[model samples]
Target: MKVFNRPILFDIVSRGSPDGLEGLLSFLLTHKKRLTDEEFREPSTGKTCLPKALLNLSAGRNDTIPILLDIAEKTGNMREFINSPFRDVYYRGQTALHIAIERRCKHYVELLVEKGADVHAQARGRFFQPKDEGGYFYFGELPLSLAACTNQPHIVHYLTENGHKQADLRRQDSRGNTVLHALVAIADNTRENTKFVTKMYDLLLIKCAKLFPDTNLEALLNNDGLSPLMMAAKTGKIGIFQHIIRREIADAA
Candidate 1:
């Protein structure tokens, strides 16, 4: 299938102001009228349709979400638009929600969640391969796991407050690392500003304790049989190791 290159649309959205965005959206709808459903297929160049593209391009412009969502609904692309994984090779399997959270686009994340995008959805697709030597390392991540691994406490709070549950917190990735394991991998003890790192450790560990009080934090291991404390020790996350010690969650044996 021949791919469509719509540079003009990209240019408009990339640089458009509020009013300009409105105009461009109107213009897109006019063009949307001409294409059939089959034309809405994923582009070979890894780009997506205007509605989905607008969601990403209209960064920091909460005002444009309704208009873009309207366009998606009218064009019968809402499902694909919200669930569309990245076609780009580097970030394939990542959806707009994943991008929004990683970018710290709170408004966009809220919008996607409210629009019924799957919070529990795993970004696993054709490009997602855990053992692919030359491929991306982040093969799969739940939205919550990504937030924790990336140190986005705000996103973590938002996801938990919305509909994410205690059970949901236990999800692991392709590597069999749970959200706590993910946090352990990124926890650092050498940062000049240890305040935030300490806070992240407290928040993540405390939440797990409250939800699964009986969970053997030290015994919980990934596929490699490395426990959370083992991971913390291996990564030299001195702060996390201390926190685990203080909580008495580390297995003595």
Candidate 2:
């Protein structure tokens, strides 16, 4: 019924400023028929819809979820697009939830969760590189694990407290690293806010332990036999180790 054949729509949605995004959102809403009848794909990439573009754009930007939700609500494919993964494109199979969690957008994360996004969504990547260089990265990840790895304690708590299953916490990547292992591996030891980071690390550990009481603290090893504690030590994250010990998660035996 309408056409979004504007060549600049992609750039406006992807890299435009907040004001520009607002303008584009208004234009799309004015032509809302295009969302339901015609495709909202980028002219250049041909791999994104308004929802996907908003999600990926929100990855590096903040305070844009409202705009994203507005577009999604008008698209007529809200649920279907919300669950669609960015397959064979950038980020490789990552869902909207994945981008939200990885970016640590607490507001966006909460909104998506409340909007019925899949808490247990898993995204796989063909090849990745670990920043710590502890091991080669070749795996997928749950949103919970991504939140933990990104050190977003608020989001971590939200996910854990929102009726997400214990199995979600236990879901590992191709390398067998659970959410706890990921939390330890990416703990920010060099941050000036030691207290803040410590609290984050502690909150994640407490929630993970509470949900999965039988989690194998010692036996659960990564592909390289790196236990959470070993990984923490290797990563030089004394804060995570201290919190783990304080919680009686790992003893000094």
Candidate 3:
């Protein structure tokens, strides 16, 4: 199945500006292009070009999101545009909402959420999900996890505090790893990496303690019967383990 607006698809991505957006709007307004249709398919990403295998245009061009709102108005279906690809090797179930976090676009993140993006959306695709050794970008699966792992406190706070779509601190992936475990999962132990990792862990712990006053943080264990503290120790994240242990003694005092 060939894409209807194949050439124009990548064109929109490269030339995403007021003028370029106007051209795209012209196509959509005139019915030449539809926001709901497949614009192009990356053959490298999949064998069969299922609808789930392709990405829509409104996704990559965070710049054109306001323009996309116009198209969404007519279609009466904005969520479809924001959350494409049920699964693809490239995005691997990652929605535009997820990309906004990765790109550090707090404004777009707010817009996408207010307009209707799933706060708990996870992209467990091969590229995102970690293997034991062959790894690139492995974090916890949720949008909050990515925001925290990426060290964007503003984005993380928005996801956590937003009244309309608050993120769940207790959420876990199929592996039973919570957002805390996701932090440990990516430990590189480099001097700089450990510094930020320790900071994020402390912040996450404080935030968790505040958010859920009664819940025992350790009770939310992963599938392996290892709590996050155990995970840090087993993975040899000595900095994290020591910080946690020291904090523990000080709190006991």
Q: By lDDT, who's the top model here? A: 3
What TM-score would each prediction reach against the true structure? 0.70, 0.61, 0.80
lDDT string, candidate 2, 1-253, tens digits: 3334444545555553444455544566676544323355433333444344445554455434455556666666566556655554334456677766665667667777777677777665544455433333322367877766565666777887765332266566766887767666556666554465466555655565777787654447888888777777887888877766676744554
Ranking by lDDT: 3, 1, 2
Model 2 is weakest, by summed lDDT over 10 consecutive residues, at 131-140
Query: Which residues of candidate 3, in runs, are more than 4 Å off?
Result: 1-4, 21-34, 39-62, 86-91, 127-133
> Model 2 segments beyond 4 Å from truth?
6-39, 42-47, 50-76, 87-90, 123-140, 163-167, 187-199, 216-219, 224-226, 232-253
> What's the distance in Å from true for residue 82, model 3?
0.8
> For each candidate, C-alpha RMSD in Å?
5.5, 6.2, 5.2
Q: Per-residue CA lDDT of candidate 3, range 1-253, in tens?
A: 2322655555554455434555555556566555656443444442111122122324444354576665665666577665554445443666767767887778778887887788888777365445434344778778988987898889988998897788877788767888888888777777787788778877777788899987766568999988888998988888767777887899899
Question: Which stretches of model 1 miss by more than 4 angstroms?
Answer: 1-5, 17-59, 87-89, 123-140, 163-167, 192-195, 211-219, 249-253
Cα deviation of 24 in candidate 2 (Å)? Answer: 12
Whichever of 2 and 3 has more lDDT, that candidate is 3
lDDT of 1 by residue, 192-248 (tens): 424554566568667767767977444667887887778778878888778778667
